[PDB]
């Protein structure tokens, strides 16, 4: 779902950037490791939605931090 | 027993570095030995310090014949629910897991000057995961039978304030090590993917071992 | 600083093994620490000993504010004579060689309780070799300027007998290491053909002691 | 017979751990031996305990010369209908199967001090699969000829309460083992696909062996 | 503490085999347990014996609260000259070697009913390699400071004759094991080329381990 992979990619890169903005070193490969996905480009939609839940929660927590 | 270095230099007003420059003893070792935490001491060190401070070892070594030996349960009554609240994303012990309960028995064989030794049993249960900082937390335990061990408290408070603090340290350190050991065997590694402050990435293991659980009871107030 | 565990046990007749069993401490460590030989002591050890012996750490640790420091000349005045003959019969440094001269000054600071400290220079020259054993001979050095060290004797015997013996042991070791380092470099190894020892090893084992009115023991 | 450790330390008020710290005996072994269940004991153990408690073996060991030996039917009259109501999804013995009937004969060769031995026959029939917890159940049996074995009850109650409890334990344990053995041979493996509570996956076999069937009759009340 | 089986059946006049046939206990285990040497026993075994003999455990077990714990020197003062006079052709410990001297310290922490414990030091030296038979020898040791340990003897003789014999056995056995251990580490294997009597071939090691060194002193007469 190239539209989903762009949304997922934008959020995971946003999460990486926010971590770096927080001063916490962040790399895309690690945030992909959080999703434990082997290929972001090819994934089932439900997994993109499931991944979002992980990133959004994490993104919000650094906000509180 | 404990060296009174901290009390000695507080009374003198001198600093550890100043003493180290005077007695030619390594700053790190001397500052560690200044704290009662160090368990080993050198004869050269006691000679140099006693001479520098112009005092006999009497003032250097605070000794009380009442020996408090502590033993812990080989198997405790511990339940640790695992809550997967993004420990990796947030390095907080609460995010990694939570102690449902942690109760066990701490046997204290208090020994007077005479070989006569009195044993006190402590039903100690986990009470709360106190959050000292946003970064780390301290587990807090409580003695259910502390009222029974009122005589133990009488013996604890019968010692000097410095020796009382040394016991509290020893109890806290043993308890921390024990709790961290149990938890690290019960909880899988939860590595932190993103380092906080980019300084280092720490696995939950490093956090729980770093976590220092200090027992809280009227038996041990200070 | 003088552990009196040894003295205390002689007072109470308590065997070292008996104390080790009662205080749950290794016999080897307790016996090593008994004559204050080890330079490291565990807080647990002293705590257990004090509680067990019903003593304050005062009766365990005897300390005299006075401090003695010994500095040896970087370059000593030494001459060597190597016989190379008779070492083979049985370990004997004297047959293998001997030190014709080994005069050198040792700067000794006797520090008083007052920050001020007193510097005394003693010149010790090779006097003879002590035949303590046929296998081992200990070099003897005599103080030439004992006049400058008259106060040195007074400070030395001002300390307790145990402390005096401690000093004598330390100075003896230091002198032995000094002379062995100096000599082994100028001495070729001789194999003990008559379990296997090289004259170098002999030099290492051979010690030296300052025989003087200032240090009689 | 049984060591009176449980009764001894109840009277003393001491805890097993406290005794273990005193007599240098392993906590697990000592706590097991504290219960009358242990079938073996060490002279070292009896020496250390008798000395610690400052008591002769008389008090330490409670012995009644009346020996109750139990034998069970090689072949019982057992009918076990299989009703597989989702045992794999719900771990309840009821869901796995149900005992239509389980009657058999338990021969008890009660022996007095004298070699004179009296044998009592027990027509014991399954009565109900009592559900102790939502997780596990206890099979309940009943003696049809218990009124005939009224003399047996007279002999049972003629013993000490501790020894009576020890017999009840022995009878229950033998009966449980027997019943679980018969059922496990009669019922195929019904593995539990989903670990119970997710903590561990246990097969019906493990459940029935874990199941403890205690006989219920006026002969054995306590 | 020791089971008084030997004394019990001596008084009854019965034989171990006869008892074993009665209580269904293995002859070897029962005969070993009849001797005080056994360090382990079964509740089933005590139940059966107490019932068969119609006696309470009081008579069955003899316990004296005075506990004699023995400790030996980690390093002894031992000199063992090697004189190989054809040990392989003649299997005599004397032919294999000879003890020049074997002195060491045996610490006995005698404990009364109260935790108060008294320690007695035994300067024990090898005296003679007593030759019990032409085949084997017994090493004999002697306590130099036995006169100092006169109080120990007072405590030893204060016990029952059976318990005294049990101590003597324990002391002998520990001493034998210790001496054989030291010697076997100090003496190389001296295999016996010709089986002794042709029945079996035994190495010096087997001979010294078989060798049983019993201490001899007025402290321990019987």
Author numbering:
A (entry chain 4E): 140 to 204
B (entry chain 3E), D (entry chain 3F), E (entry chain 2F): 2 to 223
C (entry chain 2G): 2 to 195, 201 to 223
Paper quotes:
To parasitize a phage, the SaPIs employ a transcriptional repressor, Stl, which in addition to repressing the SaPI genes, senses an active phage infection by binding to the phage-encoded anti-repressor protein. Here, we show that the phage satellite SaPI2, which does not encode orthodox anti-phage defense systems, provides antiviral immunity mediated by Stl2, the SaPI2-encoded transcriptional repressor. Stl2 targets and inhibits phage-encoded HRs, including Sak and Sak4, two HRs from the Rad52-like and Rad51-like superfamilies. Here we have focused on two recombinases, an annealase called Sak, and a recombinase called Sak4, belonging to the Rad52-like and Rad51-like superfamilies respectively.
The most abundant particles revealed an architectural structure formed by fifteen Stl2 dimers acting as a molecular filigree decorating two heptadecameric Sak80α rings, keeping them apart and generating a ~ 1.5 MDa structure. As a result of the asymmetry between the number of Sak80α and Stl2 protomers, two Sak80α subunits in each ring were missing any CTD density while a further two had at least partial albeit extremely poor-quality densities, which were left unmodelled. The structure instantaneously elucidates how Stl2 is inhibiting Sak80α by interacting with and corsetting Sak80α’s CTD. To our knowledge, this is the first visualization of the α-helical bundle present in the CTD of a full-length Rad52-like annealase. An overlay of Sak80α models revealed that the CTD was fixed in two different conformations, either up or down, which in relation to Sak80α’s ssDBG might be seen as open (up) or closed (down). This flexibility in Sak80α, provided by the loop connecting α-helices 4 and 5, is suggestive of Sak80α’s mechanism to load ssDNA onto its ssDBG (see discussion). Despite the modest resolution of this region of the map, it could be perceived that Stl2 employs its two loops in the CTD to interact and fix one Sak80α CTD. Mass photometry analysis of Stl2-Loop 1 mixed with Sak80α revealed the formation of larger peaks corresponding to 1 and 1.5 MDa similar to the wild-type, while mixing Stl2-Loop 2 with Sak80α did not generate such peaks, thus indicating that the residues mutated in Stl2-Loop 2 were critical for complex formation. When Stl2 is present, two Sak80α rings are ensconced within a Stl2 armor, preventing Sak80α’s CTD from engaging with anything beyond the Stl2 cage. The two Sak80α rings are kept separated so that they cannot interact to each other, a proposed intermediate step for efficient complementary ssDNA annealing.
